[PDB]
Design a protein around this nucleic acid. Sequence first.
RNA 1: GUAGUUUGUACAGUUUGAGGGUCUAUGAUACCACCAGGAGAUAACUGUACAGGCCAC
Lengths: 749, 130
Amino acid sequence: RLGLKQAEERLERDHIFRLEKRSPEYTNCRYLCKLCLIHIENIQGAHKHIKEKRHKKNILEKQEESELRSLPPPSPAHLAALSVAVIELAKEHGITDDDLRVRQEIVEEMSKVITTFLPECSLRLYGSSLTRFALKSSDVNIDIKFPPKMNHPDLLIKVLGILKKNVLYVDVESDFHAKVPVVVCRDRKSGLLCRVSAGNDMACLTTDLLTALGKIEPVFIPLVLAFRYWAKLCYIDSQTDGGIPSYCFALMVMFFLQQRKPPLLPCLLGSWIEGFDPKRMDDFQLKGIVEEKFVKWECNKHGKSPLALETPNRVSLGQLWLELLKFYTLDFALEEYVICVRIQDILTRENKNWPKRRIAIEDPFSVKRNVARSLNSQLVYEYVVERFRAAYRYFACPQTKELYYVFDKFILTSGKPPTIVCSICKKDGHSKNDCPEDFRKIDLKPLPPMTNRFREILDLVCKRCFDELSPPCSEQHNREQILIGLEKFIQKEYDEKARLCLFGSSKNGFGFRDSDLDICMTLEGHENAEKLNCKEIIENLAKILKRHPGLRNILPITTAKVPIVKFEHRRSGLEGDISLYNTLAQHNTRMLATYAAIDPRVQYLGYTMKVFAKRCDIGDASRGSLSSYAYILMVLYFLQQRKPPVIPVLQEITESLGELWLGLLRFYTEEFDFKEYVISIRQKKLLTTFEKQWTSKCIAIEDPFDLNHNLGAGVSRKMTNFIMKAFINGRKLFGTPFYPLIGREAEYF
Amino acid sequence: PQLLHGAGICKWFNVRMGFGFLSMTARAGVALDPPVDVFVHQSKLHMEGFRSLKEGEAVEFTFKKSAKGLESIRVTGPGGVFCIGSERGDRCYNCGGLDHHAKECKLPPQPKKCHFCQSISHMVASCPLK
RNA sequence: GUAGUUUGUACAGUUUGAGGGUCUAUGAUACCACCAGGAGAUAACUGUACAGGCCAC
Ligand SMILES: [Zn+2]
Ligand SMILES: [Zn+2]
Ligand SMILES: [Zn+2]
Ligand SMILES: [Zn+2]
């Protein structure tokens, strides 16, 4: 009996504990690791749980935590040295009030530059720059307040172009893909970063809240200079790289000053509000700052709340700076609690219905959304805890020289580069340069030299997909005979004004030999279906075709642009459609047929795309992939982007075939960005996803006429990965030379 | 191999320097009465690593005659298996045995018992009678 | 609220990597000397726990 009680001590040595009652899902499991949070079944499995590499990293994590948990408390000489270190960080290159004036001069100069071209726009310095919660080499936060009679991507692009033309604010970037689309630049006079945003008045009100707190308390100004210098010394500040924003770090230390007993900043909502309730705190909407001492609030009756304690209590900056890292390494639960400073009380994840596996912070004036959503990967979070550990290990250890401290790179980085989760795919285990789904990085395997025999093989493979599916002229004769017969039948039965016009699979250039007879109806004296009772015509024609002993498969459909009837000719056994003055679908089909009629290579490449998508399990939208219509659209988009544009833009008004298709695969692997640009015809410009706001969707393959739904907005990103794998295979299986059996070339492909 | 085969037992073998003598009961596939003595070296043992022989174990060899006496050119175990070595490579931490190892071990876990005095109070490296 | 096409980290088993005092040669009658308390170091596949990513209902 006691043998098992002694054997379990080795398990208990690293966080294994037996569970009294069965879990709702982990029923048969009996044991649990505190560090792994994964239920365990039996003792031999627990030793098998000991061998887990996840449990191996967790043990080192806990050992580091316990190692620097018990550093000796700082001496008064140590406190004085820490105070000297934080004031020299704050004064030598950290933003002082003099450097705050320098930042204000920078923003005023940039405002002069912008208002020279955009006088209706107005620049507001805000954010981590102005708040006196800054850093030595911060990025300036600037909001643009503009009249609403303009496009926000258009003004952002214009500001980006102005800054690119400007020679002072160098290093202009167009990061329009983050949670806030921001222009980036670098002020040369200060030599520090600057950024441009617009419309984030919630963060402007938060900035005013923080700056009022700063005019109240003095330790405000050095504390986040020190904290943000640690944060940029560990590369946690890059929210684009899965980190946490600098403004969120400002809010983090504001919550610290709120919660560091005895408190040094008062909260915004409290007991002085008679009739206040913690649960309905989101209903207490706040407003701007009055006299830099109060915050306004109003319910749709109003009032103001203090931002000051009536005595600015003075404690040493070194003690504050050490206990900040104490709080945010060993005292405050980073993931369990949302960092919420609207109330002194602890606010959980489900209280704002947010996930529970990383850090969440709330914007004071945007309490609906989590501003700390950029934390995704668990490994990056554990590295962040490790960097907090390295900071607390150094700064609470006495030094030799004489006590002296300096924010060295190597003491906190420990030589290890930061665990940057991939900013493109947001998946751990690989860096930004290691993203497989990155379109632009697919260049690691340049092609072997293209033999002309290989070119002939590719030409034959691309040609066979068309010629095996090309309709013959006798089918055209049969279809026009069925056309005139159906015209005579509908005229003699339903309405003599009915005239027939072949379109679609008979006449779009994409139909096959046994395709459907898609026929448009026209009425004498009627140029549109709006004047016609479409449902009555559809149902009467359906009844009459049912009465026809020569036409079968009759069925009305109302899901098209105008209601249609699908049927089948019994004698030819040929399916077909009847469409009444299609509103747009017919115009789009006519435009596609005109694009086909401009160059038959469009039909050749499209048939090749259809067959190659079929063999790569992505044949049509009936199988969940891109439609053959979408395939034709992206083919036409490639022909546009293959400069000089092989097809033109109708709305704006000599490569070999196998190499044309291989160049389509090459373009849709690496020469084109799906997440950044739009596959659409309407403009010759490389239409960005930021222009059309389809950054939330995977692939922006947009119809030039059907602007309502992006075709790729119906297509998943894992289907995007599948078709990207198909394109890469076309670069490899179809794009590298091979000499298979005659007729088996495409089958081998 | 060479026609001068043989079989027998291991009379003696030094682990440290790596040679010995075998009591051969067979000579070139023909049984002997009485057995004779044939020299063996560690290099004659067709094994990888630091080859060695356990005294008293059975061996099959191909031998030769030299000036110093009979010497076994190539020596293996019965059926071509590897040899053992003089025995006077780590035990299972689950069970204290070379029979299995811990991943292979499926018996329920054992208390931390010292090997020398067979007591669960202490570990064997801190045994008082060691 | 739920399915769909998918990343990591672990998961149990299988197949390969050190066999886990590994390592170390000194060719003709002797070596094995002198312990840690530690549940075993990768690559591949299968099944998978969990969050992240996505499209539709
Ligand atoms: Zn565990
Ligand atoms: Zn990636
Ligand atoms: Zn065992
Ligand atoms: Zn003992």
